[PDB]
Structure 1
Amino acid sequence: LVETGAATGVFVGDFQIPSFWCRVSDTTTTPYTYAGDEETTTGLDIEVNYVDFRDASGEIVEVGDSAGVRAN
């Protein structure tokens, strides 16, 4: 995440969607336990989650956005 200006307050990042990915079986262990087979990303939703340590009142809240990966 890179701030657009010196004091703009807007952060931008980017990356490229892969054809395959490896699912996490159990998130309650460190390190995570991974599945044994790759899966296509097509037909799965993609989401980003941001955690604001300080909202308009100075309290912790989490916000997000979603989108769909498609194929032809």
Structure 2
Amino acid sequence: LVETGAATGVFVGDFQIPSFWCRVSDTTTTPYTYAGDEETTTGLDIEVNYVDFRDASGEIVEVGDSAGVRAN
């Protein structure tokens, strides 16, 4: 994440969606235990989650957005 300007307060970050990704078998252990086979990301929904330490009232509120990886 990089800020747009010196005092803009808006952070912009980007990446390219891969064709193949490795699914995490379980998130209950560290380091994560990954599945043994990869799967194509098409059709799956890509969701982000920005952890907000201080909401408008000044506390932790979990906000994110949703999108889908289209295929033709």
TM-score range, shorter chain: over 0.9
Unpaired runs of at least 5, structure 1 = none
Give the C-alpha shift of residue 45 in structure 1.
0.3
Question: What TM-score, normalized to structure 2?
Answer: 0.97
Unaligned runs of 5+ in 2: none
CA distance in 2 between partners of 1:67 and 1:52 (Å): 20
Q: What is the CA–CA distance in structure 2 between the aligned matches of 1:56 and 1:66, rounded to whole Å?
A: 22
**In 1, Cα distance between equivalents of 2:14 and 2:24:** 23
Identity %: 100
Deviation of residue 51 (structure 1)?
1.1
CA positional deviation for 1:70: 1.2
Alpha-carbon distance in structure 2 between the residues aligned to 1:13 and 1:22: 22
- Count of matched residue pairs: 72
Runs of 4+ in 1 over 4 A off after TM superposition: none
Cα RMSD, aligned residues only:
0.6
